[PDB]
Design a protein around this ligand. Structure first.
Ligand SMILES: *[C@@H]1O[C@H](CO)[C@@H](O[C@@H]2O[C@H](CO)[C@@H](O)[C@H](O)[C@H]2NC(C)=O)[C@H](O)[C@H]1NC(C)=O
Ligand SMILES: *[C@@H]1O[C@H](CO)[C@@H](O)[C@H](O)[C@H]1NC(C)=O
Ligand SMILES: *[C@@H]1O[C@H](CO)[C@@H](O)[C@H](O)[C@H]1NC(C)=O
Length: 506
């Protein structure tokens, strides 16, 4: 079971499916406490209920809140933003264009009114960017320097105050007129700028109130167990600079010996075993991508480790986002052949309009339906599969009929492992697909698409945060109306298409 979830990576990109965007976020963050990656709350309408964000305590990446009409984003328990990643490379926190502009009295103007990040006492790396927020107050009465960590090398700020309404003053309870909102419970609590000795964080003014060095954001007691957050690692209750290595060395021989107290690194914590879908490494870490020349090794049970493949190392098929294809945003005639005979692909596959439109300027001839037969041997994709264009002549995605797993170690917009949109396909035909390691599935605006409801999607997912988002595909009544359905021989009514070849799970 998990208290950890993953953020997204969409930046300011428009959600392709406004009708399911919120449902995605909800699935993504509900019950979540620690957000690996980034917390991006964008393009939300004024009627958006965001209560599912109430348990978020820390965000490993950055926090983006932009282009929303909603009036409040309940992040009252967000204690720390590590900023392992930054918006525009500088900000750990970015609040942009949240308000309609850039029968009045009736409808209360849309837009964020107050931040209310009353628990946010720590930004390890990165700055604060707040711009064009018409109904926003108090952002200027906050002592950001206190929030920024001492070692924060990017304690930069860019706060806009041009408001479009008048602000009521902070509650009388707030000491130096510093608050996140009008409430008496929004007084900014300082934990750095008001400390004794020279300690980074503290509970009060007294030298005894100082927090343990390994703490971050704050503390209740003076012990390294009274931290509100761990600056580096939570080791089963105590914050430490590093975890216990997996091996102990011999004093004279210096020969490895397993360590009963050994733990891998996963986010800001020391764990005994890496969680599902992650890779265990030589260096005792939990990662989605292996070391220099080290490569994946699938054990029977599924636990894929990373072994030394420094010197003797068999070549593999890298996909989009990896190695030379790291910046390529689509499969084209210029790279299609690189996948010939690839059983497994380390990276992702994405097909866009241009893929089949071809780019005459680069003399990259359009991709041909027959060229797609290159993936017929493909059984695994460690990344994601994105398809926003497909040849009308082809009725399904049978070229991927032997695709068994899509780990989703890398997600589109950091959220979706499988995306099918604007296509002309009549059915999926992904007959061998038995798993989506992580990420959500998005299938929408596929007019002639049936056999979506016939797929046992729940069987493919592996964690509580996954689900299928779908809308605007061929109506189920029309499919059934045309008499379409799983072949009589399909055991439990489950199939990926029309024929007998499309049935599922016995
Ligand atoms: C470090 O991790 C431990 C878990 O090992 C956290 O302790 C949990 O705290 C919550 C709320 O205080 C309790 O509901 C759990 O029962 C605790 N689990 C255990 C076994 O201790 C601890 O809060 C974490 N410390 C920090 C600062 O992140
Ligand atoms: C939110 O706005 C959309 C705009 O299309 C509307 O369809 C929907 O009913 C609204 N939801 C609520 C909570 O009223
Ligand atoms: C605030 O308003 C002033 C005057 O209207 C304008 O010059 C300035 O660019 C605005 N700040 C921002 C960055 O929105």
């Amino acid at each position: 079971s998990t208290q950890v979830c993953t953020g997204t990576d969409m930046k300011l990109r428009l959600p392709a499916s406004p009708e399911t965007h919120l449902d995605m976020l909800r699935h993504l963050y509900q019950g979540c406490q620690v957000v690996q990656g980034n917390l991006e709350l964008t393009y939300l309408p004024t009627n958006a209920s965001l209560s599912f964000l109430q348990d978020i305590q820390e965000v490993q990446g950055y926090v983006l809140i932009a282009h929303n009409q909603v009036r409040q984003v309940p992040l009252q328990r967000l204690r720390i933003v590590r900023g392992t990643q930054l918006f525009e490379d500088n900000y750990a926190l970015a609040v942009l264009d949240n308000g309609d502009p850039l029968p009045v009295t009736g409808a209360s103007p849309g837009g964020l009114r107050e931040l209310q990040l009353r628990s946010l006492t720590e930004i390890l790396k990165g700055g604060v960017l707040i711009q064009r927020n018409p109904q926003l107050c108090y952002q200027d009465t906050i002592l950001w320097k206190d929030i920024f960590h001492k070692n924060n090398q990017l304690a930069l700020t860019l706060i806009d105050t041009n408001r479009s309404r008048a602000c009521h003053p902070c509650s009388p309870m707030c000491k130096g007129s510093r608050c996140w909102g009008e409430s008496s419970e929004d007084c900014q609590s300082l934990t750095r700028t008001v400390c004794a000795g020279g300690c980074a964080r503290c509970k009060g003014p007294l030298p005894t109130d100082c927090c343990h060095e390994q703490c971050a954001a704050g503390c209740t007691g003076p012990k390294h167990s009274d931290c509100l957050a761990c600056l580096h690692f939570n080791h089963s209750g105590i914050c430490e600079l590093h975890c216990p290595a997996l091996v102990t060395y011999n004093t004279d021989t210096f020969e490895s010996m397993p360590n009963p107290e050994g733990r891998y690194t996963f986010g800001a914590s020391c764990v005994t075993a890496c969680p599902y879908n992650y890779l265990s490494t030589d260096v005792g870490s939990c990662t989605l991508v292996c070391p220099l020349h080290n490569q994946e090794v699938t054990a029977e049970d599924g636990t894929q480790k990373c072994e030394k493949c420094s010197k003797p190392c068999a070549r593999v098929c890298y996909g989009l986002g990896m190695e030379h294809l790291r910046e390529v945003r689509a499969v084209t005639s210029a790279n299609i052949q690189e996948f010939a005979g690839c059983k497994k692909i380390f990276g992702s596959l994405a097909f866009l309009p241009e893929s089949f439109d071809g780019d005459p300027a680069s003399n990259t001839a359009p991709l041909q339906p027959e060229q797609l037969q290159v993936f017929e041997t493909l059984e695994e994709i460690t990344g994601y599969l994105y398809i926003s264009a497909w040849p009308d002549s082809l009725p399904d995605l049978s070229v991927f009929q032997n695709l068994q797993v899509i780990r989703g170690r890398i997600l589109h917009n950091g959220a979706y492992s499988l995306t099918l949109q604007g296509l002309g396909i009549s059915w999926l035909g992904l007959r061998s697909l038995r798993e989506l390691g992580s990420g959500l599935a998005l299938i929408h605006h596929n007019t002639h698409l049936c056999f979506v409801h016939t797929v046992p999607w729940d069987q493919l997912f592996r964690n509580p945060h996954q689900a299928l988002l779908h809308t605007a595909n061929r109506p189920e009544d029309e499919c059934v109306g045309e008499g379409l359905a799983c072949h009589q021989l399909c055991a439990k009514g489950h199939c990926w298409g029309p024929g007998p070849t499309q049935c599922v799970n016995d």
